[PDB]
């Protein structure tokens, strides 16, 4: 007998990808507003984590985010580019989100930012519990969802000759989980 | 400085890794927790809960309220069972959908005892006897009341007690079974006596059925198969 | 050497990181500090200071000396209030510009009590009664003196004491409010009695208004929105 | 942080390295072990087992049951030996295939004593004498019974005891020999007396032969030569 692997920590704290944020190099050819990528942290997209969390009503958890950046030249053209640096900015709840590539939010002291140098160990931060409430509500029978923050991403190098696309996989691992008030689990139907 | 020697495994991200990591909000005073009722410390606490078995998964009955009710009627006293429930909690479509089954689908291995609980939802007046049998693993399920009686069984008296909690044991060659494919036993309910009723009381009653893991139950080797 | 294994997070610069770092001037003898008067150990010490509320933010009054003075006059005894001040210290344009508001704009969350302090700047001779009311959050502000009196209030006597320090309480569902959007209460000042004056003394006095955080006040989750 | 200085040998994978490594299944509760009979803690425990020598590796005899039996017959009393077995356990085709030899092929160096055990598989009635000789290393094997008798030997009596366990000693200039090329000695069995039998009992008996390492045996410097 042993019930360790069916503990909440073991059942939940498992590195799961939750998004793939794509950003292009600031190439001066015809580039759109794809120069930066923004994703509001939410578990309602990945079915695995969501279906596991909706076993329970309330919750609390730190949130370890790992970032796996993978780039490649777009054109078959004789591509050359020095090592790119990526600004991975975490925007806490209630804070403003970037609108442009050169918005002020990328220079704000509040917003913590990682400067990942390409071709190195995957970047990582550990967001704490950022809830106004004393527990993340997965279901709320009231009138006026919970804010974890936003992740914005850009390339720092600016006047680049050759285009370079890059995908940032975000491996979210909830850590120090607590969950209350179990519920019936949803079918996989409406996901 | 301190001479080091970077070993293999350096600069790899193993998604199962457990290291310290730098906090992005290190000056932030976390909202303290409160004592909410109902903290779950373990998933098996949800499988230890008596949840209702869907017995009739036919085309019409399924995905309604009728898929759970087993109807006892008055018809020719056939020796065949009222219900025969295979004990493949993961690889049985009926137990697969229970809470137990929902937790077992998240795991590969499991071991322990199950407790089944049938519940007569008929009249206070009606009386009779059902025979709740348990064929162990390897056995071909009982086809007649006699074959079932000779083995393990419980003569449940509809008249006296309205429920019947039979507990299955943990019999397996390995220390743990699988959640997919191969036996595991059979609960099965027969009439010992056709149900008696007084006056114009309805002669069509219902029995419900519940299942839950026991305190000895355990799972291991998480396996999430959820996708789109 | 000591075998190590570089983990994820290596060679990243997190602007929130807190590590040791090599000093560029390691042989340099720093100018020692002196005991200057007025060391601030915390920003809330600046929000605990009674600063003056601008009540009249009209086109003319604003960005002058008149935007702070509330003029009491002699006109038909209308039940409407002299002033009604919403308790959105961050999301109220009047309290937004106070020192308290300037410190709250740097933060997301806050919690605590406020103390408002009205101050009669009229004559030593003039006498009368104002009624300083406090509608709690959720309440629609009082429109008549009666509605205000029935709730929480203070009958301030212009003749006896020249100030009136009403302290708001900390009422919120969360442990902390937001600095942007939704209620929070209303201070509001009515005439109980039209102000009496002796001889040709002017019948147009002024009251000032101050606000400050209390010792129980606290903020968290810094949010600088300063840019060009 | 702690200033380090990555030395030579960093980021190399030496297949002989022994470092810690991150577990891919860190939350997984391993199936506990049981007490199975027959745990082997060392490979020499398999070389300490008396396994049967194939003496006749001729074209026909080999890869059958006859390659192990040494046939004693009744023919002209030639002084030549019944068998002469060179003590190159690795570099002798006969001892090479024994369990001892199978373990020695996995190693470069070895040292210790061997015990050979011949076994008469004839009649309870038959009687006679064999002479089991041991020429030490460097010696040219004995060609006549006299030359063998003068050296080390054992006059085995077929009539009394049915086996004969002669133990070779550890004689080598180095502390360890090689498993390939050069001497090491010779066991050799002669007739002292042609085997007597009573009545029509068959005059063609068989002796088997076993070999095993002793408790003093040891190997070192693993050398796997297995390929396709």
Curated annotation (Swiss-Prot), chain A:
Transmembrane regions listed in the UniProt entry: none
Query: Where in or outside the cell is it found?
Result: Virion; Host cytoplasm
Source organism's superkingdom?
Answer: Viruses
Oligomeric form and interacting partners: Interacts with capsid protein VP0, and capsid protein VP3 to form heterotrimeric protomers. Five protomers subsequently associate to form pentamers which serve as building blocks for the capsid. Interacts with capsid protein VP2, capsid protein VP3 and capsid protein VP4 following cleavage of capsid protein VP0. Interacts with human PVR.
Free-text function comment from the UniProt entry: Forms an icosahedral capsid of pseudo T=3 symmetry with capsid proteins VP2 and VP3. The capsid is 300 Angstroms in diameter, composed of 60 copies of each capsid protein and enclosing the viral positive strand RNA genome. Capsid protein VP1 mainly forms the vertices of the capsid. Capsid protein VP1 interacts with host cell receptor PVR to provide virion attachment to target host epithelial cells.
Q: Would you tell me the protein name for this molecule?
A: Capsid protein VP1
What is the source species?
A: Poliovirus type 1 (strain Mahoney)
Which residues of the parent protein does this chain contain? Answer: 649 to 859 of 2209
């Amino acid at each position: 007998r042993s019930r360790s692997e069916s503990s909440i920590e073991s059942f939940f704290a498992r590195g799961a990808c939750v998004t793939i944020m794509t950003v292009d190099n600031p190439a001066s050819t015809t580039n759109k507003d794809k120069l930066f990528a923004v994703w509001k942290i939410t578990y309602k997209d990945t079915v695995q984590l969501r279906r596991k969390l909706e076993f329970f009503t309330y919750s609390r958890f730190d949130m370890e985010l790992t970032f796996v950046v993978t780039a490649n030249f777009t054109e078959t053209n004789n591509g050359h580019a020095l090592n790119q640096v990526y600004q991975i900015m975490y925007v806490p709840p209630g804070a403003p989100v970037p609108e442009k590539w050169d918005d002020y939010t990328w220079q704000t002291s509040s917003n913590p930012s990682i400067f990942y140098t390409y071709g190195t160990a995957p970047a990582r931060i550990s967001v704490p519990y950022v809830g106004i409430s004393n527990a993340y509500s997965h279901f709320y029978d009231g009138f006026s969802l919970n804010d974890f923050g936003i992740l914005a991403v850009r390339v720092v190098n600016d006047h680049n000759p050759t285009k370079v696309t890059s995908k940032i996989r975000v491996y979210l691992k909830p850590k120090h989980i607590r969950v209350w008030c179990p519920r019936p689990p949803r079918a996989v139907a409406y996901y | 400085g301190l001479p080091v020697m970077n070993t293999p495994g350096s600069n790899q991200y193993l998604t199962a890794d457990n290291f310290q990591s730098p906090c992005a909000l290190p000056e932030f005073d976390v909202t303290p927790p409160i004592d909410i009722p109902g903290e779950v410390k373990n998933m098996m606490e949800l499988a230890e809960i008596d949840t209702m078995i869907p017995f009739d998964l036919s085309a019409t009955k399924k995905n309604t309220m009728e898929m759970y009710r087993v109807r006892l009627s008055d018809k020719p006293h056939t020796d065949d069972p009222i219900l025969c429930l295979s004990l493949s909690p993961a690889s049985d479509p009926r137990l697969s959908h229970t809470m137990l089954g929902e937790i077992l689908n998240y795991y590969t291995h499991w071991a322990g005892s199950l407790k089944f609980t049938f519940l007569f939802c008929g009249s206070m007046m009606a009386t009779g006897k059902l025979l709740v049998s348990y064929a162990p693993p390897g056995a071909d399920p009982p086809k007649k009341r006699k074959e079932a009686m000779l083995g393990t069984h419980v003569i449940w008296d509809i008249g006296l007690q309205s429920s019947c909690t039979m507990v299955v044991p943990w019999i397996s060659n390995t220390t743990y079974r699988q959640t997919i494919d191969t036996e595991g036993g059979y609960i099965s309910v027969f009439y010992q006596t056709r149900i008696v009723v007084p006056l114009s009381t309805p002669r069509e009653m219902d029995i419900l059925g519940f299942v839950s893991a026991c305190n000895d139950f355990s799972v291991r080797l998480l396996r999430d198969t959820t996708h789109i």
